[model samples]
Target: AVGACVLCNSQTSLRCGACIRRPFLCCKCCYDHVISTSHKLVLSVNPYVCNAPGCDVTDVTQLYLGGMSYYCKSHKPPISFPLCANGQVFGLYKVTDFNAIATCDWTNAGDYILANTCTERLKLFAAETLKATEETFKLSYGIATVREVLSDRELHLSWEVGKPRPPLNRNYVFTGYQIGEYTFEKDAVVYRGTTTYKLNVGDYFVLTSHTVMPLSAPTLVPQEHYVRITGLYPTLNISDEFSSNVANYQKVGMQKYSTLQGPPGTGKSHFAIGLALYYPSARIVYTACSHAAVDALCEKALKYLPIDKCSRIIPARARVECFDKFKVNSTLEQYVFCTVNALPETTADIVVFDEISMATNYDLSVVNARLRAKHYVYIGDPAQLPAPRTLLTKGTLEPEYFNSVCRLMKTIGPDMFLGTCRRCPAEIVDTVSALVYDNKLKAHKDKSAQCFKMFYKGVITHDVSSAINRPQIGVVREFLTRNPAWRKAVFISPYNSQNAVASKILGLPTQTVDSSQGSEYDYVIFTQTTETAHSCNVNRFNVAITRAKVGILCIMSDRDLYDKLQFTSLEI
Candidate 1:
């Protein structure tokens, strides 16, 4: 607080007030600069950092002109800086002034101050801790430096005109480009938030009044194993292949309510991974039916977005963590393990409910109301599993108003399948298609498909009691031995007693259709333990048969039933 006004160099108290971003305002000038909300100011503190427009670069610089704190390529009459008159000139002071002054270096505009014999020594002060308040808030007028220069490559910029695009406020950036000249006819233009015109590349694009921010390393996706679903989901204000459905949803007055239906092995989980690839900057919450299904999603996120960008809500079962860094968003979060009732409001930008067929009216309603997102995508097939048995918590929700997620999906569109099934081989897919779609129990193509049947010799069809025949276990054991990968195979039965007996005999875990809805295996040994009439429930059969990827060994208790069903008998 010793020199004249930084702007006019007037003889005064030398204490600075806010007028410009710097602390050079005179006491008499305090009332001269106030106008708008962005006009607030800090006192006596001028830290020489990059004052680049919309730039978040905090790296300190050393260029000091009486400790000037500002920059840009071309010099313009700055609204804050006192160097408004020096647009065409570089004012160099005498070498003797440094003994009483301080010297800091700007990375580009190096040491402008000299010391001792011009060798260097100066004073230090407590200006770095200066705070801005109502009493000291000074008026700031005019914009920052306006110099034009060539961009080296893709440049990070902020819109100085209307509103800042992504990488600003709460939004994210999925695509970026090298700072360079772009052409409207030659180079394609992709707009983000408000007015950020981004391009892949072009020639001779010149820098104008745009503020360039520092570049961050790009977040990448594993393109080989995943398909990008940008056009598949709805986008806000932006339209593309995936976004075309936005109008359809809007026509029904259901923009926020969206769902993607697919049967098992139809890349539902893989599609979720695709969204992660396309929108790393978007705050995403992904949940599923069971902890195992949630863990599967966590694995894909860790394998792909591996950074702290993704998280899972750990179940309350005292289960082990997926990895040390793999932590929970919140224990009470939906589909994570716990019985918490409420969720934080407006938490994420996108929330995906996987295996959505298991979601109840309560789950759908609570999430639809609690989450704040541009897109809420649910992926699952109602044919695989029905909603969990639970009463509506709000006493009684209207039948059509609050319902299952799939029920909501049906209102918006049909149960649309993705494409082809990648996990299941042709044999199982055909057999499943025949039973689930055609409703016909036809014989398997003779030896053409691996999903053939084996006749269990001595299994009796007593109405109240049944167990897997012991010899059939030997046949499965040999099959597993021949195809070692089939060790991951599972045996599923409609009856728990039969599951226990077959599981013990086959040396594989037993699962009912209800328990294995969101799961799959290398092979499935389904012992048709119940009578075909009762076991042929399309829902149960779809969940069980679709769990197999390679083949299925459908063993029947009564040989005549297989004969009537006309199943191809494989030699065992």
Candidate 2:
């Protein structure tokens, strides 16, 4: 609906329909002049006072472009987007004619905010974590004029490449002598040249007397405080449906509301823990089918969280010396572990309900009640819902929520296809992937050779841990020869059971994950869920499943007892 495209004003217009990233994130014009060599241009500026009567930016406190409508960054108090475009900010760039005197100011200092892949905050965190500050990690590359004042240094400007490495994600740049040269490296970029500014929300490494390029990919680093686990790690291919579904929830406000849906071995619980670490003040609460799952996550927290921080969060009274049902203290707010039913309403900013496919209508309702927080996340695989039927099991299931969303999304042609799987054997994942297609398990598709890989390995039928066992007697055991091979591995079944197990194997009253002990070992064991008969069975299971980083093994003793239960089916 306008003249030349941002890239080519030569009668070539990438209208809303033709404009890639339409609706949600509108602008995608890499090179405005097809005839000219290109530089990366990342940011964009649009003019609209949000749906208003006139073409005035001042009257437009909010506007909606990029498919999903939103409050204009230039204005205050905006609205939400009606749709989504891979969760991107939509706008038109390549501003050829803005009617300078009549229309809005194109280069106003406060008119634009940096928009890129993911959020600006996460990118900053990444640079901080990798210590990439010393090196030229964040090379700004965009389509906007920048101002920089280096410490006691003179000002400079121009377009040139800085650190000469094979370029990736190339865009517009205004580098100096070289294409992207700058006085500030990553870390110093923050503390030096640019005095810190809260103006841009959290801490931002400002530019000074140097290059003004596409703000180098905001240095998106792997989130710490959290760990990601799927079938794959070092390698990941996420084109498939299963894996992408898990990944779709990794957002800030959105990440909090997302849920997981898959059978056992899908790594849903593990993904939840990983999300916890991505957000700075996030806390991970876990519970599963049995008492053991609670124990496992507790143990995982101890392993992942620093020992010193652990002591800071924990109180001496709630520790080993204290007698309590749950072995946690005030420090538990860091990574609190609990079943869904018992979860404290306010602690979790992001609440995820795992094993929902296994819940009854009643089960689902209980979960919904607890997930009233702004972000409500649920994880489940209907194909693996509440186990096979039986008399005593009740076979009860209350009204579920997702069934409705699926009805809208899966009609005629799907807006998106979940093409692959992540945490399970390829075959199982493939079968699951087919549910949205013909509902037939076709071979897995490696759509983009680059869809991050998730690996799965190392599990056993059973292994014991000191957290779940009783300790050996003192006098005689001290004198007797020990059998290393037979050293007992424990499985924490309840809050108290971890003590019994740790006491026996560790030669002291053992600590459960809830107790918050830290130690590294070649052997690490966590728990999984099996029971579905109890009122809060799913919640109970979340208790034990998130412990090991290297590997996790799950076993069940009362498999036969669940035959009469509603959620008795086991994952393949």
Candidate 3:
């Protein structure tokens, strides 16, 4: 038999009532379940409301008025917002120790007398039988003495008493033009509603001393001249041969549906920038899966290209003054930049989509819509972790349109493969190549490489075993301490749980393989979350191994599984 409410035959959630009758009530009826003298309410979380009736206090930012608190202060917020229980009032008076409104009885005298604080004030309500104290209640002393004030020329006064007070008008000004709702009409338009706020500086409250007021409107930017195109392509400072190769690609329209598959520390970014610089006249738009890649691209454009040619698109949150030095137009929204500049995807001549492997099917669609370019180039390691959680269900989720960078690898011929291994050592190159592309790649021999073991393996528990994890973390910490160069490295895991474990042990933020996309490191400490080799996820395995620029140390709980994979590791 389930406990049901007394009034309605429904499941009971909260119990409310006074003294002798504690009635069980459903959640909805609890508010109206009150009886005569007192009612105690029980709820999962406290629901607070302002007792000041017409104030309609909802958001914390809004002001509340009562007891000489004639409130409307946009300049600043209240020092504190105190919570009051059933019998108590909303406001808190702090004098070293805080005091809340204890007995709010507006039935008589229109006055409040605090028993504990020995304080009193006039109540807003007009009641006859309210209890009174022998105190006259110095209203001026309370209102006029706030320590905070504006400037030297400004006078601060607390006008609380029911006496002669200055009449304040509705002279409030708001930056309405900056607000999007106005829509900023281009043509000759007029509003029938009574518009009052000043839209810009050098504007006034009224037209004449006594005549009907003319509403102020901010100087509207002409629609045709509104911020349309804020893209910047810096001038090429050098005649690099890499630029020539991209120029060749631009001359021949064979790379419309192209893929630039390269390993870590490769010339992918260089090639992408070269292509952009090659087609200087073409309006180019660049994007990537993560902010890191975008930031790197932005940095490259600024460094390599001349200020005039490579107009870097500044993100809104960045300093505009910095962009002004270079005379570059910046935009907060990607699509808004296109709309404002009249360079709708169709008009933009080039699209350089980096870190495409991390992009989802939906990401591809949105990006494809934005690519109205003469050349579209996608540069990424397909073998790296695929889109974070999409189509992760092994055999169920089908290709929602060959939506991955790896899927389109075969579409383009030789350009898809970059055999040059410039970033990593020979030891790392061999292991990552074999695991990532399933040994379909030929590792390039490089002499100047870090001497750390290509793969360091330590067996940790497949599930949650500090036995395996803690010791492995110790080895990594000692090794990193010995060689502090790899301190910029990351610990990656397929599961969030293991990442969290490593994050705590390492005293740093651990990243899931998905989050590691678009970012590279000098060394990688990858922990296997499972015993089964297949459960390691071949795609995820590729992602983990390749993130390490110098070397990769794989932490496995199942040494048998690691051994079975035919991967020889230097056991720590």
Candidate 4:
């Protein structure tokens, strides 16, 4: 009975809690039994042994239902706690060390005091009290302030305090909390409502289990720039041919600024690589908006340039394995790769800014200021997506000024356009071009036959009744189950909640449409969660549809939305 499992005849101590026979089971046997017969199990507890009456078994490593409360492998409670043991709180806070003293009275609200020792201003955005007992409590004034500094390390502080109203559903998990315009994660086991506090900015929030400090203020980079933007020349007529464009740009010299516009799948990164190889003597700094993009550029550069000549600059926290070979802190390499935010202050002869459309004017300006490059080239598609807006630019006038460098460059327009897209099939290229680019883009004819044979149709739209959440997930699951060959497919959604649910439930590669730019996949399954005007816009649809090489399956809720966008519905 103690050595071998009764069901699977394996060595285990797990037993059925509900069955009177009390058959011992292995992990797999217990799981299969539960699935097959809808029976519960009595599993062992680790660190904390069984606390059930007349049970002292302590030689098990697995935990199951009722085990968290110290139930043995032979006994389990009727009910258990519904929340996870670990609680978490998140908020924005100023970065400073401070201490707090709390007085807990059994009957009424207690005094809470905070001491600030630093000159930097300290403020709380929200406050909450952990439950001491099942009793109602109230504070007299519900506010406190610090006064009379005792020493550099200690200062007297006071505020009115009260117990928060417990939530109606105690079993509800606190996943997120909203403060004014921002949202923070709040995974707490205890049920406590939020308490409002004054707001100011300095540092960000510190997340903790029980106690945390909220800091205000965005991280500031040092204001410095070495390169100066002098003049803008007339747009040059560079062709889609990569070799001729490199030659044409090389003749244009390093005196004035130039821009290269490439649509999706037009090989902007390839052009950047070609330009780096074109100028052997010149030191080139290649940068993009994200680390993934920068890593991709570095990976391509490593193929052509020597390992010593190409260096990728990444943050200390970035994965060492992903960039181990090309990783270097030194900007002295002939070809350097880095993100726009992490641009090092170094003088280079040529600076190539890839995905320029996704970089805000402010970030681009700051990066340009840091590099003392003779010639600058901007490459990206203005027709795709623009840079994300910050909190500061939400309601301000002239927001477009901070939107993207592409907006500014497009006033004079791109000096060159990579008009031929060789990534997608002809049907996809035709649809995307007609919808987004006003029929300016062309498909590479040589790749058309291969794409046609690989994917019978370039685009397939699945018309669903309610493509909101569960239905959309079901559609995706059913499609994947039927077509098991699309192993390289990626799930995309414009809404974060939809994508999060899909990724969590289905266990698939999921990303928001905004982040899916510049990434290609074999097949793209787009879940259009809503039929709203904004959600069904041309730009978002364009990015989602054009990401697939073989085919794209768009699950849409409403037919009118696609009709309004003038998209041909090839429904399945």
Best by TM-score: 4
Q: Give me the runs in candidate 1 sitting further than 4 Å from their true place.
A: 1-254, 315-325, 330-346, 388-403, 408-412, 437-448, 455-488, 532-534, 557-568
lDDT per residue for candidate 2 within 1-572, as digits (tens), equals 43443222333222332121221113333222111212112223333334333435322113345343333444323445421133322444422111111121212311111111113332222212212221233344322222444454332222234432211111111233222222221111211122222222121222222221111222111222223422112224332423444445443343223434433344454555544544435444453432334454445445445433221122221211211233444434545555543444444455544444333322333344443333444555443323211111233432131232121222332222323333333322332334322443233322221111111121212122112222212211231234242133333333233333334445532223332121222222332221224312332333232222222223332343222121213232
Candidate number achieving the greatest lDDT relative to the actual structure: 4
Q: TM-scores for all candidates? A: 0.46, 0.29, 0.48, 0.54
List, residue by residue over 74-167, the lDDT tens digit for candidate 4: 5656664321122201001101121111122212212111211112121111011112111112121222233343432233333234623211
Clashes of each: 18, 103, 17, 23
How does candidate 1 fare on TM-score?
A: 0.46
The lDDT values for all models are 0.44, 0.31, 0.43, 0.52
Q: Identify the runs in model 4 with alpha carbons over 4 angstroms from their true place.
A: 1-244, 251-255, 316-322, 392-404, 445-468, 558-561, 564-572
lDDT for 394 (candidate 2) = 30
